[PDB]
Structure 1
Amino acid sequence: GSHMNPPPPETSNPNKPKRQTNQLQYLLRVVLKTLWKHQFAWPFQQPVDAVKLNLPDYYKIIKTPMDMGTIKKRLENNYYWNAQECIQDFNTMFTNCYIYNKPGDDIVLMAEALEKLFLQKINELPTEE
Structure 2
Amino acid sequence: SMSVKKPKRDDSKDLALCSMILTEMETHEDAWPFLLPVNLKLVPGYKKVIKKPMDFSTIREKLSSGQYPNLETFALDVRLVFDNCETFNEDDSDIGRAGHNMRKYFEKKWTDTFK
State TM-score, norm by structure 2.
Answer: 0.83
Percent identity, aligned pairs only, is 30
Q: Would you tell me which structure has more helix in proportion to its own residues? A: 2
Query: Matched residue of 1:125: which SS?
Result: helix
Looking at structure 1, the residues matched to 19 and 12 of structure 2 have their Cα atoms a distance apart, in angstroms, of 11
> Which residue of 56, 65, 88 maps to 2:44?
56
Note the C-alpha offset of 1:23.
Answer: 1.8
Residue identity matched to 2:76: Q
Structure 1's unaligned 5+ residue stretches are 1-19
Q: Report 1 or 2 for greater relative contact order, CA contacts < 8 Å, sequence distance ≥ 6.
A: 1
Query: Matched residue of 1:78: which SS?
Result: coil
The 3 A distance-change label for structure 1 pair 85 and 111 is same
Note the C-alpha offset of 1:72.
Answer: 0.9
Asked whether the equivalents of residues 94 and 115 of structure 1 are also in contact (C-alpha less than 8 Å), the reply is yes
**How many pairs are equivalent?**
105
> Which residue of 22, 26, 35 maps to 1:36?
26
Note the C-alpha offset of 1:21.
Answer: 4.1
- Say what the alpha-carbon RMSD is for the aligned residues: 1.6
Looking at structure 2, the residues matched to 41 and 61 of structure 1 have their Cα atoms a distance apart, in angstroms, of 22
Question: Of the two, which has the highest radius of gyration?
Answer: 2
Structure 2's unaligned 5+ residue stretches are 1-10
State TM-score, norm by structure 1.
Answer: 0.74
